[PDB]
Amino acid sequence: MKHSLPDLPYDYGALEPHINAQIMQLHHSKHHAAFVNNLNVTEEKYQEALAKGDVTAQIALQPALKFNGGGHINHSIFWTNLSPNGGGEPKGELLEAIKRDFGSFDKFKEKLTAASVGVQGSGWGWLGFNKERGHLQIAACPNQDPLQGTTGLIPLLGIDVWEHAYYLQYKNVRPDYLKAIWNVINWENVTERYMACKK
């Protein structure tokens, strides 16, 4: 296909003061850009290996494909989950699903925050939808491992806990970054992803 870096739906500084412009610029234009460039290179190498039936090469390329491929997937979703018009609480069917599956919105916040802060090293915190069980589910993924590709869950809301996502502003205080990000969550986008899972 030849993947490309998607344009951001807002200005790099639109999420201030919760996430500063310098992080957004570096996070989008440098880290994400690298994943897309390396993903395209990795996909081209795998196509050659498949043509020659080189199983050894296919397996050797799996870490680069998952790492760069997942990085493209994860960050592409991440940008749509944020908005300068975000924050507050969700409404409608998504709010009802959260109460049913987690009890209340506040308890959901605590569990997703704990899952994200509890990540040892680099990874992601995710609110996902389990098609088999038909309910919401919280999961954490290491490094750039994508939720759906590795767990089967449909991603609804992702929290990047890579140090590059918060270290320029919040230093080592990961909880402060988690507390601040709730102010810019685009619940409209999360709702659209949730409704897409239902019939």
86 or 146: CB nearest its own copies: 146
How many of the chain's residues bind Mn ion (CB under 5 A)? 2
32 is in an annotated binding site: no
Distance of CA 145 to the CA centre of its chain: 10
Long-range contacts for 99-107 (Cβ within 8 Å, ≥24 apart)? 100/135, 101/135, 101/136, 101/137, 102/136
Strand order in the sheet with 154-160: 135-142, 123-130, 154-160
149-152's contacts with Cβ under 8 Å and 24+ in sequence apart are 149/66, 149/69, 149/70, 149/73
Q: Of these, 11, 21, 29, 59, which contacts its own copies (CB under 8 A)? A: 59
4 binds its own copies (CB under 8 A): no
Beta strand 154-160 with 123-130 is antiparallel
Minimum distance, C-beta of residue 194 to its own copies, in the bound complex (Å): 18
Write the interaction track for Mn ion spanning residues 128-167; mark x where CB under 5 A is met and - where it is not.
--------------------------------x-x-----
Binding residues for Mn(2+): 27, 75, 160, 164
Positions in the binding site for its own copies (CB under 8 A): 1-3, 39, 43, 46-47, 50-53, 55-60, 62, 65-66, 69-70, 72-73, 146, 148-150, 152
